[PDB]
Amino acid sequence: RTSIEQRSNAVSQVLLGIFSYVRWPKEPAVLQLCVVGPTEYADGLLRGMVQANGRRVHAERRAVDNPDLGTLCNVIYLGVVDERERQQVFRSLAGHPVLSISERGTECSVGSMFCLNVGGPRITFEANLDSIARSGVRVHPSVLKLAR
Amino acid sequence: RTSIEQRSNAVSQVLLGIFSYVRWPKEPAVLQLCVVGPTEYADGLLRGMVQANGRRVHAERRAVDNPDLGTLCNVIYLGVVDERERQQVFRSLAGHPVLSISERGTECSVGSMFCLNVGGPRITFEANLDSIARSGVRVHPSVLKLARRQATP
Ligand SMILES: N[C@@H](Cc1c[nH]c2ccccc12)C(=O)O
Protein backbone atom coordinates (compact mmCIF):
# COMPACT_ATOMS: atom_id res chain seq x y z
CA ARG A 1 0.00 0.00 0.00
CA THR A 2 1.78 3.14 -1.31
CA SER A 3 0.95 6.73 -0.21
CA ILE A 4 -1.27 7.51 -3.20
CA GLU A 5 -3.45 4.53 -2.24
CA GLN A 6 -3.28 5.55 1.42
CA ARG A 7 -4.19 9.16 0.59
CA SER A 8 -7.03 7.80 -1.53
CA ASN A 9 -8.44 5.88 1.40
CA ALA A 10 -8.19 8.96 3.56
CA VAL A 11 -10.00 10.92 0.82
CA SER A 12 -12.81 8.36 1.09
CA GLN A 13 -13.03 8.78 4.86
CA VAL A 14 -13.08 12.58 4.67
CA LEU A 15 -15.93 12.58 2.10
CA LEU A 16 -17.96 10.13 4.18
CA GLY A 17 -17.48 12.50 7.10
CA ILE A 18 -18.61 15.51 5.11
CA PHE A 19 -21.63 13.60 3.76
CA SER A 20 -22.95 13.03 7.29
CA TYR A 21 -23.47 16.82 7.60
CA VAL A 22 -25.35 17.27 4.33
CA ARG A 23 -29.07 16.75 3.69
CA TRP A 24 -30.93 16.50 0.40
CA PRO A 25 -34.46 17.92 -0.07
CA LYS A 26 -35.67 14.53 -1.30
CA GLU A 27 -33.25 11.92 0.07
CA PRO A 28 -32.38 9.20 -2.50
CA ALA A 29 -32.19 5.46 -1.78
CA VAL A 30 -28.73 5.30 -3.31
CA LEU A 31 -26.45 8.31 -3.16
CA GLN A 32 -25.11 9.03 -6.65
CA LEU A 33 -21.52 10.23 -6.67
CA CYS A 34 -19.98 11.51 -9.90
CA VAL A 35 -16.25 11.81 -10.48
CA VAL A 36 -15.67 14.49 -13.11
CA GLY A 37 -12.34 15.46 -14.64
CA PRO A 38 -8.80 14.15 -14.12
CA THR A 39 -8.28 12.99 -10.54
CA GLU A 40 -5.40 11.46 -8.61
CA TYR A 41 -7.14 10.32 -5.40
CA ALA A 42 -10.58 9.07 -6.47
CA ASP A 43 -9.85 5.31 -6.86
CA GLY A 44 -11.36 4.58 -3.43
CA LEU A 45 -14.56 6.49 -4.10
CA LEU A 46 -14.93 4.59 -7.36
CA ARG A 47 -14.95 1.22 -5.58
CA GLY A 48 -18.18 2.40 -3.95
CA MET A 49 -18.92 3.35 -0.34
CA VAL A 50 -21.60 2.96 2.28
CA GLN A 51 -22.63 5.56 4.84
CA ALA A 52 -23.00 4.82 8.55
CA ASN A 53 -26.79 5.12 8.07
CA GLY A 54 -26.66 2.18 5.64
CA ARG A 55 -27.18 4.07 2.39
CA ARG A 56 -25.00 3.00 -0.52
CA VAL A 57 -22.81 5.48 -2.40
CA HIS A 58 -22.61 4.53 -6.03
CA ALA A 59 -19.71 6.20 -7.79
CA GLU A 60 -19.09 6.65 -11.53
CA ARG A 61 -16.98 8.82 -13.80
CA ARG A 62 -18.82 11.27 -15.99
CA ALA A 63 -17.52 13.62 -18.70
CA VAL A 64 -16.92 17.33 -18.07
CA ASP A 65 -19.24 18.22 -20.96
CA ASN A 66 -22.06 15.93 -19.82
CA PRO A 67 -25.06 18.33 -19.86
CA ASP A 68 -27.02 16.23 -17.34
CA LEU A 69 -24.58 16.36 -14.38
CA GLY A 70 -27.12 18.25 -12.29
CA THR A 71 -29.80 15.54 -12.65
CA LEU A 72 -27.42 12.54 -12.61
CA CYS A 73 -25.38 13.49 -9.54
CA ASN A 74 -26.11 13.99 -5.87
CA VAL A 75 -22.44 14.50 -5.10
CA ILE A 76 -19.89 15.65 -7.61
CA TYR A 77 -16.20 15.20 -7.01
CA LEU A 78 -14.40 17.67 -9.27
CA GLY A 79 -10.91 17.02 -10.65
CA VAL A 80 -8.69 19.24 -12.81
CA VAL A 81 -10.66 21.54 -15.13
CA ASP A 82 -9.86 24.82 -16.88
CA GLU A 83 -11.94 28.00 -16.71
CA ARG A 84 -14.26 27.20 -19.64
CA GLU A 85 -14.87 23.67 -18.31
CA ARG A 86 -15.66 24.52 -14.69
CA GLN A 87 -18.26 27.16 -15.48
CA GLN A 88 -19.53 24.65 -18.02
CA VAL A 89 -19.88 22.12 -15.19
CA PHE A 90 -21.60 24.48 -12.74
CA ARG A 91 -24.03 25.70 -15.40
CA SER A 92 -25.23 22.09 -15.41
CA LEU A 93 -25.44 22.05 -11.60
CA ALA A 94 -27.30 25.37 -11.17
CA GLY A 95 -30.84 24.70 -10.01
CA HIS A 96 -30.11 21.24 -8.66
CA PRO A 97 -29.45 20.03 -5.08
CA VAL A 98 -25.85 18.86 -5.64
CA LEU A 99 -22.99 18.66 -3.12
CA SER A 100 -19.73 19.60 -4.87
CA ILE A 101 -16.19 18.84 -3.76
CA SER A 102 -12.99 19.50 -5.67
CA GLU A 103 -9.82 17.46 -5.25
CA ARG A 104 -7.58 20.58 -5.35
CA GLY A 105 -8.42 23.87 -3.70
CA THR A 106 -5.72 26.48 -3.47
CA GLU A 107 -8.21 29.21 -2.59
CA CYS A 108 -11.78 27.92 -3.04
CA SER A 109 -13.54 31.23 -3.70
CA VAL A 110 -15.17 30.15 -6.97
CA GLY A 111 -16.75 26.81 -7.82
CA SER A 112 -17.19 23.96 -5.36
CA MET A 113 -18.71 23.99 -1.89
CA PHE A 114 -15.64 22.28 -0.49
CA CYS A 115 -12.02 22.03 -1.61
CA LEU A 116 -9.67 19.31 -0.38
CA ASN A 117 -6.02 19.86 0.26
CA VAL A 118 -4.65 16.32 0.09
CA GLY A 119 -0.96 17.19 0.37
CA GLY A 120 0.81 17.35 3.72
CA PRO A 121 0.72 14.92 6.67
CA ARG A 122 -3.11 14.95 6.88
CA ILE A 123 -5.95 15.85 4.52
CA THR A 124 -7.49 19.28 5.16
CA PHE A 125 -10.27 21.14 3.38
CA GLU A 126 -11.74 24.60 2.94
CA ALA A 127 -15.37 25.69 2.71
CA ASN A 128 -16.90 28.10 0.18
CA LEU A 129 -19.76 29.79 2.07
CA ASP A 130 -21.31 31.38 -1.03
CA SER A 131 -21.35 28.07 -2.92
CA ILE A 132 -22.89 26.44 0.13
CA ALA A 133 -25.70 28.99 0.34
CA ARG A 134 -26.53 28.75 -3.39
CA SER A 135 -26.21 24.99 -3.20
CA GLY A 136 -29.71 23.54 -3.10
CA VAL A 137 -28.73 21.21 -0.27
CA ARG A 138 -28.59 21.83 3.48
CA VAL A 139 -25.29 21.91 5.34
CA HIS A 140 -25.26 21.50 9.12
CA PRO A 141 -22.92 24.34 10.23
CA SER A 142 -20.98 21.91 12.44
CA VAL A 143 -19.05 20.82 9.35
CA LEU A 144 -17.15 24.10 9.45
CA LYS A 145 -15.56 22.92 12.67
CA LEU A 146 -14.05 20.14 10.50
CA ALA A 147 -12.41 22.54 8.01
CA ARG A 148 -9.09 24.49 8.05
CA ARG B 1 -19.94 11.05 -28.72
CA THR B 2 -18.05 8.37 -26.74
CA SER B 3 -18.59 7.57 -23.01
CA ILE B 4 -15.96 7.73 -20.21
CA GLU B 5 -16.18 3.97 -19.70
CA GLN B 6 -15.93 3.33 -23.42
CA ARG B 7 -12.88 5.61 -23.71
CA SER B 8 -11.22 4.02 -20.67
CA ASN B 9 -11.60 0.54 -22.14
CA ALA B 10 -10.19 1.66 -25.49
CA VAL B 11 -7.17 3.32 -23.84
CA SER B 12 -6.43 -0.10 -22.35
CA GLN B 13 -6.32 -1.62 -25.79
CA VAL B 14 -4.29 1.12 -27.40
CA LEU B 15 -1.69 0.82 -24.66
CA LEU B 16 -1.60 -2.99 -25.17
CA GLY B 17 -1.10 -2.21 -28.83
CA ILE B 18 1.81 0.15 -28.25
CA PHE B 19 3.49 -2.17 -25.69
CA SER B 20 3.88 -4.73 -28.45
CA TYR B 21 6.25 -2.53 -30.46
CA VAL B 22 8.43 -1.90 -27.46
CA ARG B 23 11.38 -3.91 -26.26
CA TRP B 24 13.17 -3.45 -22.95
CA PRO B 25 16.92 -4.24 -22.74
CA LYS B 26 16.17 -6.68 -19.91
CA GLU B 27 12.54 -7.86 -20.18
CA PRO B 28 10.92 -8.38 -16.74
CA ALA B 29 8.65 -11.22 -15.63
CA VAL B 30 5.97 -8.66 -14.78
CA LEU B 31 5.73 -5.35 -16.69
CA GLN B 32 5.38 -2.54 -14.14
CA LEU B 33 3.08 0.32 -15.18
CA CYS B 34 2.80 3.53 -13.17
CA VAL B 35 -0.01 6.07 -13.43
CA VAL B 36 1.29 9.47 -12.40
CA GLY B 37 -0.77 12.63 -11.91
CA PRO B 38 -4.56 13.15 -12.23
CA THR B 39 -6.12 11.03 -14.96
CA GLU B 40 -9.58 10.66 -16.45
CA TYR B 41 -9.02 7.46 -18.50
CA ALA B 42 -6.76 5.17 -16.50
CA ASP B 43 -9.37 3.23 -14.48
CA GLY B 44 -9.14 0.39 -17.03
CA LEU B 45 -5.33 0.24 -16.89
CA LEU B 46 -5.45 0.04 -13.09
CA ARG B 47 -7.34 -3.27 -13.19
CA GLY B 48 -4.08 -4.84 -14.37
CA MET B 49 -3.65 -6.01 -17.94
CA VAL B 50 -2.29 -9.04 -19.73
CA GLN B 51 -0.12 -9.03 -22.87
CA ALA B 52 -0.62 -11.57 -25.68
CA ASN B 53 2.39 -13.63 -24.59
CA GLY B 54 0.79 -13.86 -21.16
CA ARG B 55 3.03 -11.41 -19.34
CA ARG B 56 1.04 -9.57 -16.67
CA VAL B 57 1.04 -5.81 -16.56
CA HIS B 58 0.80 -4.58 -12.99
CA ALA B 59 -0.53 -1.05 -12.58
CA GLU B 60 -0.63 1.45 -9.75
CA ARG B 61 -0.60 5.18 -9.14
CA ARG B 62 2.55 6.87 -7.94
CA ALA B 63 3.24 10.37 -6.66
CA VAL B 64 4.54 12.95 -9.11
CA ASP B 65 7.51 13.70 -6.87
CA ASN B 66 8.60 10.09 -6.30
CA PRO B 67 12.35 10.19 -7.05
CA ASP B 68 12.43 6.49 -7.99
CA LEU B 69 9.91 6.40 -10.82
CA GLY B 70 12.61 5.42 -13.36
CA THR B 71 13.43 2.46 -11.13
CA LEU B 72 9.93 1.43 -10.04
CA CYS B 73 8.35 1.68 -13.52
CA ASN B 74 8.76 0.03 -16.88
CA VAL B 75 5.96 2.21 -18.27
CA ILE B 76 4.68 5.64 -17.24
CA TYR B 77 1.12 6.74 -18.01
CA LEU B 78 1.24 10.48 -17.40
CA GLY B 79 -1.65 12.71 -16.42
CA VAL B 80 -2.04 16.39 -15.80
CA VAL B 81 1.06 17.99 -14.33
CA ASP B 82 2.40 21.55 -14.33
CA GLU B 83 5.68 22.79 -15.77
CA ARG B 84 7.77 21.91 -12.72
CA GLU B 85 6.14 18.58 -11.99
CA ARG B 86 6.80 17.48 -15.56
CA GLN B 87 10.45 18.47 -15.18
CA GLN B 88 10.56 16.40 -11.99
CA VAL B 89 9.08 13.32 -13.63
CA PHE B 90 11.20 13.27 -16.80
CA ARG B 91 14.39 13.98 -14.87
CA SER B 92 13.54 10.93 -12.70
CA LEU B 93 13.34 8.84 -15.90
CA ALA B 94 16.55 10.06 -17.54
CA GLY B 95 19.00 7.20 -17.95
CA HIS B 96 16.43 4.47 -17.29
CA PRO B 97 14.66 2.24 -19.87
CA VAL B 98 11.13 3.64 -19.58
CA LEU B 99 8.21 3.95 -22.02
CA SER B 100 6.14 7.10 -21.42
CA ILE B 101 2.61 7.74 -22.68
CA SER B 102 0.51 10.85 -21.94
CA GLU B 103 -3.23 10.87 -21.52
CA ARG B 104 -3.29 14.25 -23.28
CA GLY B 105 -1.70 15.30 -26.54
CA THR B 106 0.26 18.36 -25.40
CA GLU B 107 3.13 16.62 -23.62
CA CYS B 108 4.80 15.38 -26.82
CA SER B 109 6.77 18.64 -26.90
CA VAL B 110 8.12 18.25 -23.41
CA GLY B 111 9.15 14.66 -22.78
CA SER B 112 6.50 12.08 -23.41
CA MET B 113 7.23 9.43 -26.06
CA PHE B 114 3.56 8.94 -27.03
CA CYS B 115 0.62 11.32 -26.54
CA LEU B 116 -2.98 10.13 -26.59
CA ASN B 117 -5.80 12.10 -28.12
CA VAL B 118 -8.92 10.64 -26.49
CA GLY B 119 -11.39 13.04 -28.12
CA GLY B 120 -13.28 12.02 -31.25
CA PRO B 121 -14.70 8.71 -32.53
CA ARG B 122 -11.44 6.83 -31.93
CA ILE B 123 -8.31 7.17 -29.82
CA THR B 124 -5.41 8.55 -31.81
CA PHE B 125 -1.87 9.25 -30.68
CA GLU B 126 1.25 11.11 -31.68
CA ALA B 127 4.91 10.47 -30.91
CA ASN B 128 8.23 12.27 -30.44
CA LEU B 129 11.48 11.00 -32.01
CA ASP B 130 13.81 12.85 -29.62
CA SER B 131 12.11 11.46 -26.48
CA ILE B 132 11.98 7.95 -28.02
CA ALA B 133 15.68 7.96 -28.93
CA ARG B 134 16.78 8.91 -25.39
CA SER B 135 14.26 6.50 -23.78
CA GLY B 136 16.52 3.46 -23.33
CA VAL B 137 13.85 1.14 -24.78
CA ARG B 138 13.58 0.03 -28.41
CA VAL B 139 10.49 1.04 -30.39
CA HIS B 140 9.58 -0.54 -33.72
CA PRO B 141 8.53 2.12 -36.29
CA SER B 142 5.46 0.03 -37.19
CA VAL B 143 3.87 1.42 -34.01
CA LEU B 144 2.64 4.27 -36.20
CA LYS B 145 0.51 1.79 -38.20
CA LEU B 146 -1.60 1.85 -35.06
CA ALA B 147 -1.96 5.64 -34.88
CA ARG B 148 -2.60 6.01 -38.61
CA ARG B 149 -5.36 3.38 -38.88
CA GLN B 150 -6.89 4.90 -35.69
CA ALA B 151 -6.88 8.40 -37.27
CA THR B 152 -8.93 6.94 -40.15
CA PRO B 153 -12.75 7.16 -40.46
N1 LIG C 1 14.62 2.65 -32.06
C2 LIG C 1 13.95 2.91 -33.33
C3 LIG C 1 14.07 4.40 -33.70
C4 LIG C 1 13.10 4.83 -34.78
C5 LIG C 1 13.38 5.06 -36.10
N6 LIG C 1 12.24 5.44 -36.77
C7 LIG C 1 11.19 5.45 -35.88
C8 LIG C 1 9.84 5.76 -36.09
C9 LIG C 1 8.99 5.69 -35.00
C10 LIG C 1 9.46 5.32 -33.73
C11 LIG C 1 10.81 5.01 -33.53
C12 LIG C 1 11.69 5.07 -34.62
C13 LIG C 1 14.52 2.03 -34.45
O14 LIG C 1 14.23 0.83 -34.53
O15 LIG C 1 15.28 2.50 -35.31
Query: In chain A, what residues touch B38 (CB-CB under 8 Å)?
Result: 37-40, 79-80, 103
* Technique used to solve these coordinates: X-ray
Beta-strand (E) ranges in chain B?
Answer: 22-23, 31-36, 49-50, 56-62, 75-78, 99-102, 114-117, 124-127, 138-139
Q: For residues A84 and A90, give the distance between their C-alpha atoms in angstroms, rounded to a whole number.
A: 10
Could you tell me if residue A54 is left (phi over 0), alpha (psi between -120 and 50 degrees) or otherwise beta?
Answer: left
Residues 6+ apart with CB under 8 A from B49: B12, B15, B16, B33, B56, B57, B59
Pair A51, A17: CB distance under 8 Å:
no
Q: What is the resolution of this structure in A?
A: 2.7
Do you know the residue count of chain A?
148
The CA-based angle A61-A64-A67, given to 5 degrees, is: 100
Q: For residues B42 and B78, give the distance between their C-alpha atoms in angstroms, rounded to a whole number.
A: 10
Nearest CA to ligand 1 atom 6: B141
**C-alpha of residue B146 to centroid of ligand 1, in Å:** 14
The CA-based angle A80-A85-A91, given to 5 degrees, is: 125
Q: For the residues of B6-28, what is the DSSP string, one character each?
A: HHHHHHHHHHHHHHTTEE-TT--
Q: For residues A110 and B63, give the distance between their C-alpha atoms in angstroms, rounded to a whole number.
A: 27
Q: Which residues of chain B from 90 to 149 reach within 8 Å of chain A, CB to CB?
A: 103
Which of B140, B144, B146 to mutate to test ligand 1, by most ligand atoms within 8 A of the CB atom?
Answer: B140
Residues 6+ apart with CB under 8 A from A20: A51, A52
Domain boundaries, chain B: 1-153
Nearest CA to ligand 1 atom 4: B141
Pair B135, B97: CB distance under 8 Å:
yes
**Residues contacting ligand 1 via CB (< 6 Å):** B 132, 138-141, 143-144
Residues 6+ apart with CB under 8 A from B109: B128
Nearest CA to ligand 1 atom 5: B141
